[PDB]
Every structure is written in C-alpha cells, then in structure tokens.
C-alpha cells in the first residue's frame, strides 16, 4: 500500500525492513509545555533523540514507527528534524490519547467529526505539514472503556475504512481493555490483521494474549526496559513461549522508550533506580541475544521485526 | 506598582477604574490547537477580541481580568496584540483548569511542586516573558472535588501566601463545589477576602449563595448572557435580592464571555436561543439599568465594579 515517511518521498510496504513498532522520540503534555516552556529543553531533548536513532540504526533498524499523538505531544516539525539529522524512516501516526474524557472541545461532537481529524492527518497532512500519518493510535487503561474512550476507538474504525491505514492501541494488560478494543474495532468492520493491541507484554497471562492473537490481531510485547510493568527476564520468558507455540506471525516487539519524558515517573532521578536498562536498544542488548540463545533462529526474529510490520502496513 | 498588567507597568490596588472581573479574550484546548491548527483562525479571533474590548472601553470599562489559564489556552503573546490594539488594563493570571485529573505530567508530583509553577508566572513571567500573573485560577465542576482537583486547590493557597495575589475560582453552582473550594483555601492560610467563588450566578438558590458570602468570600455572578445556566431576567432578580440584603460589598458581576469559545456547545450556528444577548457589554445594556431602575444607587455599582475589585487585589 506504500507508507508515508516524515519528510521523505514515501516508501513501499515491502521496503521498510527492520523496524521498531512502538518508540517515542519525545512525549509531553501539550498543556503543561505550552504554559511553562521553562520546564523543557529542546536542545537537550533533540540530542537525546538523535543519539538513540543513530545508534539504533547502527544495529540495523531501518524504520521507526512513533505512536506519539494528541495527549502525548506529537510534533511533526521536531520529528522532521530528527529525520534530516539521522536519515531514519519515521512513520508518524494520528489519533487521540486519553484514559477518561476528551478535551472540552469535543463536547457534543460526533464520532465522525473526530474521524475527520484523523482522515485529515492521513489525506491532507499533519499540523499544516505535508507529512501524512501512516496509522492511528488509540488508548485505554485502568479506567476501562469509558464513553469518550469508545468514541475514539470508533473514530479510528472509520479512519481505517476510509484510508486503510493500520491501528495501534495502548491498553492495560490486566483489565481486558485490549480485548475490548479488538471487539469494537472488529465489529465496526476493521480487519483484525490491521490492529496491534499494545502493552500486552506487561503480563505473563499467556492465555489472555493468545485470545487476542487467535482473533487475528497483533499482540504488542512492546515495553522492554520498563521494569515497573514487568521485569525483562520475565518478559523474555513470556515472549519465548508464544514463539514456541508458533505465534510469531502475530508477535511484535519494541521498547516504547521516550528519549525524553516529562512524566513524573520518568524524572532524571527515578529512571536510575527504577527502569535502569531501559534504552531504545534494550532488545539488541538482551532480548534478541536471549532468544537466539534459546535456539530461535534468524528466521523467527526476521518475522517479528520485518515480516509482521510489513503485513501490518499493507 | 503591585498589580501586574499585560504590556503595561504595574499599578496600585486603586486607580483600577471600572473593571470586569471574569472575561476571556479567547479559550481553546492546548492539545487540540497544537495537533489540529486547521480548526482555528487567529485572524478572526484577534479581530473579535479587540472588537469586544473596545466596546467595553466605550462603556467605561478600564480593566479586564482574564482568568484564562492552563487547560483554557492561555496565550500571553496573543493578549499583547490585544492590549497594544486597545491599551486596556488586561490582568493575566496563573493556575490550572481541570475537572477530574491532571495531565500525566503531574503524576507523582506533589501539591508543593505544582504551586512552584504559578509562582513562576507571578514572580518570573508568563511563558518566558516580563508579563507577571496577578492571580491564580482553580476550577471544579460536575465531577466534584477529585484528588487532582484538591491538589490544585491546595497549591493555589501556597502561591497566595508567598505572592499575595488573590484567587479566582470556577465552580458548579449545583453541587457545593464552591463551598468546598472555600473550606479548603482559608485553612491553607489564604485570606477569605482574597478569594472569589465564581459561577454562583448560575443558580437562583439564594440560600446557597449567601452561605459563601457569609464567610468573607466574594460571590461570583459572572455568567450574564449564558442563559443556558440561567436566564438574564432571573439573574437580575437574584442579584437585586442580594443587594437588597447588604451583600453588595461582596458581589462581583461579569459575563465570562469568550470572544472565541472553543466548546462545541457554543457553536456558531447554535448562537441564538442559547445565548443571543451574550456579549461583554450585556450588563450595561440590561443589568445595570435594571438595577438603577429598582432603587440601586450609583454608589453601589461603583462598589461592585470598582471598590470590590480593589479589596480583592490588596
Ligand atoms: Co501506551
Ligand atoms: Co468558569
Ligand atoms: Fe507508547
Ligand atoms: Fe471563565
């Protein structure tokens, strides 16, 4: 189907090669950064991002999909810089990120009005730019599938139909929000194969993850490093298993790393003694080497990091 | 010099002239305007802002307090273009406007680290400018007093103590959220006379109102025009009753008009019927004349619109 890149003539589905499916160059709360720019440092952030991408490309990473959308502080101009300064393939997406309600702006507005916003970022461009969204991100968490949360999921379903672009979800692995995102998206006509249920690696309940995969969707083991949601040695033990059961065709791995996080749980103070080894290369340093160590083979890891992302964007 | 102004030198608590205590030059959602700027037209917004501000001046309005803060789309620089085009005593403020929870950025952070933000705008400047904040605005609505909501309130108190600036609040006149904000600010040291429970004019329940006034806190009859919450005539009737009971010295009147409201509930087409007369000079055309006509002398009004504000910023 061909995919739009941040500041590039665009590439074809089959030519994305080794790609990381959930990585944030930078995340912040639009509101806070707009009212207190003194808290942030573009230069310090820009560099932290450059070091990651380049040294992530050194490992062979050819494409990076960044699910940073509204609520996370998407910035197409910042992302465009990183591209010019690295040459990496960035796939920017659209959508909305919320756990409970929508900004007051969305009061008594139709799901169609929302989908329009997504379709705009896909057809027209992003933030007055020519860069187009190659997907749509949606979220759900502890609060569950709330009213406004469901409205976004449906707005996503429409955008998919109208554009054919895939969907990436943030979910809570413990409250079945992921399975619900799948139920709704499927009921609305979305192709399960065009759905990636995220943050499923945050659990070791193999029986639940399989239920989502058996329905034909991708299961997102996409938080290597964040030891707060699940230790690495226990995540690897989980991924290594779904692989033994032949679920590679639905397995997607990433870090969900944020070269720069304004989160109170990501301060330049906590990380050290919370999620130490949490880099955009944690998989090459541990995961992958571990898998090969358990006799997986290059074919399988090629499936997870090349074939899957390929089927996903086509 | 003790009360900050946008694009002007500070002034004394006095010579503030006829003032509108609660008016918005324009409101919007930080997140939405960033991600989808195609939804807004600054050219138009600017013309309307300057437009209204002028007519206000034509009626003797010398000062306007704009309680637009985080969540409502505060833009100091935009306010400058309005002041320079009118030369109005526009007072800017700091604070956070939420109904339920804070942006993930505040997750973990303490009520103390939040107060530090307001103080920056009060001492240093708003969004990296010499423009100081003359007050703090907190909010609470239908959802009630949530954890995050309460955190913001207590933070507001801290700021008042070290800065001396008053607090303008937003509440729901139907769920005691206003009284709560009152029983939570005074305790933190804040001087009751330095508070202003707003949106009390949205109800005809005289008992509920008098209760807040009977505690040294200013009552906010500040939504003239917004018939959705209460018709003009029924408001005029309510304010008159309060005056006829000596609650004059504690009464503050305004429109809470959004020369450019982002809410989807105030669409361009659904204007008439919902808030036809709604403007920033609706009180000079209706309210005031009504009052005079009903035994309220010129001194009282000068008390409500001139002195009361003074006491507020002292
Ligand atoms: Co997520
Ligand atoms: Co209000
Ligand atoms: Fe993420
Ligand atoms: Fe207001």
Residue numbers in the entry:
A (entry chain A), B (entry chain B): 1 to 314
Please share excerpts from the published article on this structure.
PLLs are natural lactonases endowed with promiscuous phosphotriesterase activity. The catalytic center contained two metal cations coordinated by four histidines, an aspartic acid and a carboxylated lysine residue. A structural analysis of SsoPox, a hyperthermostable counterpart of the PLL family from Sulfolobus solfataricus, has revealed that loop 7 is shorter in SsoPox than in PTEs; linking the active site to the loop 8, which forms a hydrophobic channel that accommodates AHLs aliphatic chain. Indeed, W263 is located at the start of loop 8, involved in the dimer interface of the enzyme and positions the lactone cycle of the substrate onto the bi-metallic catalytic center.
Compared to wild-type SsoPox, variants W263L, W263M and W263F are the most efficient at improving specific activities, ranging from 30-50 and 20-35-fold at 1 mM and 100 µM, respectively. These variants constitute the Phosphotriesterase Selected Variants group (PteSV). Variant W263F is the most proficient (kcat/KM = 1.21 (±0.26)x104 M-1s-1), followed by W263M and W263L with increased efficiencies of 23.3, 14.1 and 4.6-fold, respectively, as compared to wild-type enzyme. Noteworthy, subtle changes, such as W263L or W263I, yield to a large tradeoff in catalytic activities. Regarding the PteSV group, while these variants exhibit higher phosphotriesterase activity, they demonstrate mild improvements for the oxo-lactones and no or wild-type-like AHLase activity (W263L-M and W263F, respectively). Indeed, all variants exhibit a lower Tm compared to the wild-type enzyme (between 92.0 ± 2.1 °C for SsoPox-W263L to 84.1 ± 1.6 °C for SsoPox-W263V). Consequently, substitutions of W263 affect the relative orientation of both monomers; for each mutant, the monomers are closer to each other compared to the wild-type enzyme (with the exception of W263L). The analysis of the normalized B-factors of the variants clearly reveal that the substitution W263 is destabilizing (as confirmed by the Tm of the variants), but also that the active site loops of PteSV are significantly more disordered than those of LacSV. PteSV lose their activity before the loss of the global structure (Tm), whereas LacSV do not, and exhibit a similar thermophilicity profile to that of the wild-type enzyme. These data strongly suggest that the increased disorder in loop 8 caused by the PteSV substitutions collapses the loop as the temperature increase, whereas it does not occur with the LacSV.
